[PDB]
Structure formats: C-alpha cells, structure tokens
C-alpha cells in the first residue's frame, strides 16, 4: 500500500 501522509 502507500502511506497516508502525502509528500508534495
């Protein structure tokens, strides 16, 4: 899966 915290 991918982490929830988005990275700009």
């Amino acid at each position, epitope marked *: *899966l*991918q*982490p*929830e*915290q*988005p*990275f*700009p």
Partner: antibody
Amino acid sequence: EVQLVESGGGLVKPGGSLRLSCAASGFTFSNAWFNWVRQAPGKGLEWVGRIKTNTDGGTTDYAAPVKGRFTISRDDSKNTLYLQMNSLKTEDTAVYYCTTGEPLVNHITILDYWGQGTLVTVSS
Amino acid sequence: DIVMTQSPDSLAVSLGERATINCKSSQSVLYSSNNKNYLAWYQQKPGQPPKLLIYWASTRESGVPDRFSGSGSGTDFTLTISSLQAEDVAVYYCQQYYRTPPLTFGGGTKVEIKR
C-alpha cells in the same frame, strides 16, 4: 501563533465518562486532521485516535486499547475538538494531548502542533 | 503495526559535546516510490508537550536550531545534537508515519547534561 488549549481533565471513577476539549486558533481548523495522544505518568507517548476533515467524511480511527469506549468528534464552527471517554479504566490515567499537523503543508500524520495537555485520573 | 525501538535509554553528554540517539523500526519506513523516510523526532522537555524537531528523517522543523540533525534510512535512524546546550535536556521520541494508523512511537531516550 498556533494555539491548542485543552480543558475538561480531572478526576473520574472507573466506568464513568468524561469529555476533553481542545480549542484551536492560528490555522485552518476545518482542513486539519486532529489526533489525541496520551502519556501515562513516567511512560511514553501512545496515540489514542484521530478524526479526519469533514470533507473527508469525518472518519475516526482509534487505537486498540481504546476502541469501543472512546469517541472523537469535531465542531468546525467552534474550532473545538473533543475526546469523549467512556467505560474508563484506571489504565486510562494519563495526560491527554490534542495534536495536529499544519494543514497548509498537508501534514496529517506529522504532528506540528500540540496542546499543553490535561491530566485525567481514573480512581474510585 | 510498526514497532519503534530506541537506544540508549539514557544519555549524559558534556556541554558543547555531541549527543547521538538511535531509533529502529520493525520494518522499512523508506517507501521506494519516492525516496522519503516517513519518520519524525520529538523533543519533550519536563512538564511540556512534545515539540516536533525533525521529519522526513532529516528535514529540520522551522525555528529548530541547526545543532539538531537527523539521518538514517529504511529501518535505522539517528538524531544528533552536535553542540549540546543545557536547554536541550529532554526526552526525545521517534515516530513512524509510514503505515498510517496507528501512529506509533519509540520508548524515548533521556538526554541530560554531564557536569
């Protein structure tokens, strides 16, 4: 400045209920995901739960030792976050912090801002 | 359910010297798509809430003095305080935000001045 100010802590007996509040200023309350993190005296930090923005459906998530007894809600109109504790147990005795990331840089699990904390004592 | 581990438990370093704190994750926190480590550090002075110091393993929060530095990758991370001052006495926590909820922390490492 960012301000997270908490209230409602105090004494409560095992099995009782208590609502903590967190009043926020200095950022967009409605775009923030809010967390509650607690710290038993002389112990570490343990994440209690989370509520997303209302735009994201106001989804709430809770840590295992607390699911089924604790409830998080938000009032975007008052910039006030709530932690609502029920079926309290003595092991719930801790300082409770509200905490959130800066929504302008989209911090939802990076904890930029913390309140001063309020102590909940669960005792007969 | 990533478990965060910290070592040592306590640290006494002379003023102006270097303090080094370690943090381990039970699985990688790196995420190959970007090359970002989903890891943060917090400083908790006595009687105060945690204060965010570092995130993305090495991005220093605004206002944090440059004597604070973060490094590491994957499962192994380090917080370095190069020129230790008396005000830096606190417990320092690491936190993963890789596998989202729950947010999980390490057990902390106490830093004190040797004198």
